[PDB]
Every structure is written in C-alpha cells, then in structure tokens.
Symmetry: D2
C-alpha cells in the first residue's frame, strides 16, 4: 500500500480536510457578490481544486492551465510554455489562483503576470501548501494552508514520477524510492 | 446559495461518497498487481477523478484529456478534437477511463478507440453517472455509479454554463435558470 | 479561386520581389544574431516560408496558434494560446512574422506576451498592412505592402478557410460576404 | 547555412518544378472535390505553402503539431497530439502533406487517426522519400523525390531546429552530428 512507501506524515488527512473547510469559509465570505473563477495548474491542483470548491458556498466557475518548461530558462525565470490555456474569459472577473504548492514562486509569478494581462477585475492567490524557505520570487499569497519545511512531499495531488497523488495526506517518501 | 437554484436532488452527498468508496474498493481488488493509469476528460471529471483515486488503495497514475467538438460531426459521430492530450505513455499499461457521465456514449466510444490505438494492455471504463435512455452507441461500461433518468443534471463536476460543479450532490436546476 | 475576385492588388511576382527584398534587409540587420522567426498560424505560413528562405542566415522557426475569448478579443486583442512556441526565446532575437496587420490589437497583445519571455530583441514583420484601420500602438519594423481597407485574400489570407492558396493578393467580391 | 553542407542533392529550381508538377496533378485529380490539405509542423510548411499555391482549386489548409511519447513512438510511431486540426474533415477529401517519409511509422499512425474522423477520401503527399528506410505499410500517392539514406536538411527539414530555411535540399556534414 503506497502508504507504506511513506516514511513520514507531515499533514494528516483530517488536518487537510479541516484547513480546506477553513479556507473555503474565508473565501466564501470574501467573494460574496463577486464573480469568482477558480484557476489551477494541472495536474497536482485538481485535488485541492475539487476540495476547495466544494468548501466554497458561492456560485463559482473553474478552469485550468497546463504548462511545460522551456528548460533552464524556466528553472531560473519561471517562464513556461502554455500547453492548455484557460477557456473562460476572465476579463472583469474575480479570479482566484489555486495552487497545490508554492516553492520558488517563479512560475506562479510568471503565470500571475500572464493572467493579469487578461484584465481580470481581481486576481488573488490561494495555496494549500507553501515552502517559504525556497521562496525566491516576490509573490503575495492571499490564502495559505500549511507552511512545510524544505523536503520533497507527496500526496493530495503532489506526485513523484506520477505516483502518490491519491494519498489522503501530505507525507515524505523513503529515500530508497527517490 | 447555489443549492437554492436546485429544484430536486437526485443523488445525495452521502450517496455519492458511499458509491465512490464502493467503486474504489472494487477497482482496488481488480487492479492488484496491475499498472493502473486513470484518465478522464476535463473539466467535469476532476471531481470524480479526485474522489475515486483516493478511494483506490493502489499505486496509480492520473492523466487528462481536453477535447472540443467539430460541430454537427461530433453531435452525430462523437468525433472530437484533442485540445490537451494525455502525457503518460499508456503503452502496455492498464488504463481506466474515468467519466463523470455517459449520455449518448458517442464521444466516449470515439475516445475509447483513440486510446486503444495507443496499445494499452488493458482499457476499461468507469463512470459515476449514466443515462441509459440516451445511449446511442455500443459502449461496455465496466464500473457504474448511478443510472439517472433523462434530465439535465448538475453537481459533483457537472455544470451548466460553467456553474454548479462545486455542489456536493447531483441535482436538477429550476427551469427558469435554463 | 480567381472567379470570386473583384480585382487583383498585388501579383505573385510582386510578392516574390518584396519577400526577397525584406529577406535581404533582415539578412543584413540580423547578421551575427541568434534569430528566431515566429509566425501566427494559419495565415502567416506563406510569408513565413518565403521570407525564411530569403534570409541567408542560420535561423530557427516556430509558430503560435491562437483563439478568441469572445468580445475581450475584438476590443483588447486578448487571445487564448492554442499552440505555443516550443523554442525557448530568452536571450534570442525574435522576429514576429505576420500575414496582415489591421487594428494591431492581437499583435500588440502577443508582442507583450513574447516580451514576457525576455527575448534579447523583438521586432515585427508583415507582408500586408492596412493603415487606416490601426487601433493599437505597435511598431512595424518590416512591412511589405500598404493596402486600402478592403477584404483581401490570397498568399495565406482566407475568407471562411478558402482562398489562402491564391498566389496573388486579391479583393474578394463583397457579394461573397 | 551553405557551409555545413557536404553536398546539394536538389536545387531550388528543382524543388519548384516538382512542386508545380505535383500541384498540377492534384488539380486534375481533385477537381470537383472538397479538398483539405493537412500538414505536420514544423517541417511541412515549406512544401505546404508551395504545393497549395500550385493547386489551382478552392481548398482549405490545416495543421497538426505532434510530440513523442518515448520509445512507443520510435517503434510504433504513436504520437501525442499537441495541436489538432480545426477543420472538420468528415465527408471531405483529405491530403496529408509531408516533408519527408522515412520509416512511415508516425505517418501510418496519423493516417489511421485521420481515417477515424471519417473523411470521404485520404491520400498522402510528400516532397521527399527515403525508400530503404521504410518500416510501415503506408501508401504514398504523390511523391516528389526519392533520396538515399543520408541526413538531409533544407526546404523545411532541420537538424536541431536549424537549416529549415535553405532553399535547396542538402546533406549535412556528419561532423555536425
Ligand atoms: O515537494 C514537491 N513535490 C512535488 N512537486 C513539487 C514539489 N515542490 C514543487 N513542486 C512542483 O510542482 C509542480 C507540479 O507538477 P504536476 O505534478 O504536473 O502537477 C512541478 O513543476 C514541481 O516542480
Ligand atoms: O446532464 C448533463 N449535464 C452536464 N453535462 C452533460 C450532461 N449530459 C451530458 N453532458 C456532457 O458532459 C460534457 C462535459 O463537459 P465539461 O463540463 O467541460 O466537463 C459535455 O460535452 C456535455 O454535453
Ligand atoms: O482582409 C482580410 N483577409 C483575411 N484576414 C484578415 C483581413 N483583415 C484582417 N484579417 C485578420 O486575419 C486574421 C487571420 O486568422 P487566420 O486565418 O487563422 O490566419 C483574422 O483574425 C483577421 O482579424
Ligand atoms: O534527414 C532528415 N532530416 C530532417 N528530418 C528527418 C530526416 N529523416 C527523418 N526525419 C524526420 O523529420 C521529422 C521532423 O520533425 P519537425 O522538424 O518537427 O518537422 C523528425 O521527427 C524525423 O523523424
Ligand atoms: Mg502547482
Ligand atoms: Mg508533480
Ligand atoms: Mg465526460
Ligand atoms: Mg459541462
Ligand atoms: Mg496574422
Ligand atoms: Mg482568416
Ligand atoms: Mg514530416
Ligand atoms: Mg526536425
């Protein structure tokens, strides 16, 4: 059972469920009367995206982006290639970026600019996970789930070689599988 | 509250949670030792995809397709345009198609053929919702959640003009909003 | 085809000469640089093909395929990226290749998007240009021909996906649209 | 550019004549049909441009952009669709336009995919063909030139994204690769 590959659980299932419910409540109050559109980057965000949206008692829309790197450029600039762009015209709408994890914040910042260029009336950022230590880009995080140490984690959408996304918790795999 | 726009609940939240858990158990037993890859079509499938995968205690992978219609052709042939193809090479892998709802079964059958052309060792179909009455294509459904009557439903991923995907149940909107 | 055409504005030989001319200029202007031609499908493929073969320099070629978001496109030129370029343009000298410049809205938008990827330099080239229709800043560095505000077809330009293959630039009979 | 070339196999005028010839044949063969040219980027744009302008018929043009899945591509020619065609080809007469046919694996695969969309007819056209390398059925209806098994560049064909713009077909010096 993939859970046996985990050497440590950082955030439990109930901790996750609770926070998502918490964030959903906050966002629900903050976007009352707004025109909320949730946007996340595949594939890791679908987990949090599905959970957060059900926690938001507001009429809202959902869309996704699929990106790819240009190589070294991306690594140091966060500049990425658009593989699947969002279909909903966010012009004049209140967009909330939904991330699974913020690390360097480079790609997030780049995508933020791109989304801005499409004139949304509002543009905020919500993430379930955040690694402050790794932060090497100026990104304002409006909503944040948990600050985790600098380790490679899996679960709740986060994978390693496409596996472990289905774990109900956030944990660290054994080095052997790394 | 979007739930007030609903004139009737067909499948409750607990009914959904229960079935997804049920299906996950079945699939878990059936894919023991297999090389399971879950594939769904955006955007409606992310809800069921996220829930079903967590209900499957097996190492597994997830990927998505994004499609668009060619017009009348699609309507009568199910032939669609690929907007976002799956990234994982499914050659020799046990693929399980994850649908939110099977209606005519036309697009599902078309996409099934395309997926077959990529030589997966196995290719099955799982859906949370199914409208038998509308079925106008020969599609073998291996796993099925609930058979619903011929009505336009929303919730758990299903939308209407991009809204209602975040409802925790499957229901029918009031005709006024239609 | 040559039956729904009200009049021919630019001949095939006219197009060839101008392409050779623009190619020669770019060869001189970009000598010693890391040149990348980026055209916007589908219309730009004729010009892209003819211009690149007329540039006597080592260069790369890539394309963008875009789509409209609705009215947000008509008024602000904001578009959806359906196919992005694969070549990493950071530190490179990019030359946008266009079939025709009109309002300049979409062009202005894509221009900013590419700048977002930090190219060393970014210029714009188009075979056709409709001056009296401009409604966006955008500087055009290389331009083939200035034309009146008529619906033209040919050399890549279509009407309902037709006429792109005409080897000349012609005016479509208004009755056809 | 013309410095890393070991030898020239086909001149620019040679390419032009053949394109005109293939265009004339297709004009005769497809008269009265609903023709749709579909080329595979990036390599096919030169030939696509030259061939379409040499077909004196009303036609449509579209493109496919593909990517590899890994080894599954090398052995079975199975590819990932990065950019699909927008034109609905059902009931239409499609002509796949290729820059070069080698093993024929990817071509065979895309061919089946397009057939899946029920076109009235489906034929294949290529400017270049390497016979001794074929490792897939696939019938070629229109072919420009047969060439030996050498790595060629030019008229759309590249090596590391370079040389597509050469106006002739040349053999790349082995040292360069
Ligand atoms: O600890 C981590 N685990 C998994 N992905 C991470 C982590 N930190 C940052 N990432 C990034 O998360 C992105 C997720 O890609 P996805 O798996 O396709 O959704 C990648 O670009 C990773 O580099
Ligand atoms: O009752 C229904 N509600 C919503 N979508 C439905 C229903 N029955 C069939 N569909 C199809 O579900 C697909 C879902 O598209 P999506 O919303 O982008 O995920 C569409 O092509 C619909 O035609
Ligand atoms: O007279 C004209 N003929 C063809 N295209 C035109 C003309 N004037 C402006 N355009 C632009 O050409 C673009 C071409 O899109 P494409 O056909 O997909 O390459 C359109 O979005 C138009 O806005
Ligand atoms: O000699 C050659 N020069 C260039 N491409 C070749 C040659 N032989 C085979 N090819 C094929 O050309 C394809 C071109 O891809 P493109 O450059 O993206 O258009 C490659 O995937 C190769 O398999
Ligand atoms: Mg992310
Ligand atoms: Mg990942
Ligand atoms: Mg579906
Ligand atoms: Mg829908
Ligand atoms: Mg253009
Ligand atoms: Mg057009
Ligand atoms: Mg080719
Ligand atoms: Mg190549």
């Amino acid at each position: 059972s993939p859970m046996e590959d985990i050497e440590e659980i950082l955030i439990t299932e109930e901790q996750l469920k609770a926070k998502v419910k918490e964030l959903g409540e906050m966002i629900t109050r903050d976007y009352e009367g707004k025109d909320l559109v949730l946007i996340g980057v595949l594939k890791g965000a679908i987990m949090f995206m599905s959970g957060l949206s059900r926690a938001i008692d507001l009429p809202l829309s959902i869309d996704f982006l699929a990106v790819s790197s240009y190589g070294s450029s991306t690594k140091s600039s966060g500049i990425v290639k658009i593989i699947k762009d969002h279909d909903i015209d966010i012009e004049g709408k209140d967009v909330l970026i939904v991330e699974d994890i913020i690390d360097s914040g480079l790609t997030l910042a780049y995508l933020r600019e791109t989304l801005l260029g499409r004139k949304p009336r509002s543009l905020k950022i919500c993430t379930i996970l955040d690694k402050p230590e790794r932060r090497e880009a100026d990104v304002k995080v409006d909503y944040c789930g948990f600050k985790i140490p600098d380790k490679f984690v899996v679960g709740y959408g986060l994978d390693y070689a496409e596996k472990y996304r289905n774990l109900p918790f956030i944990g660290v795999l054994k080095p052997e599988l790394y």
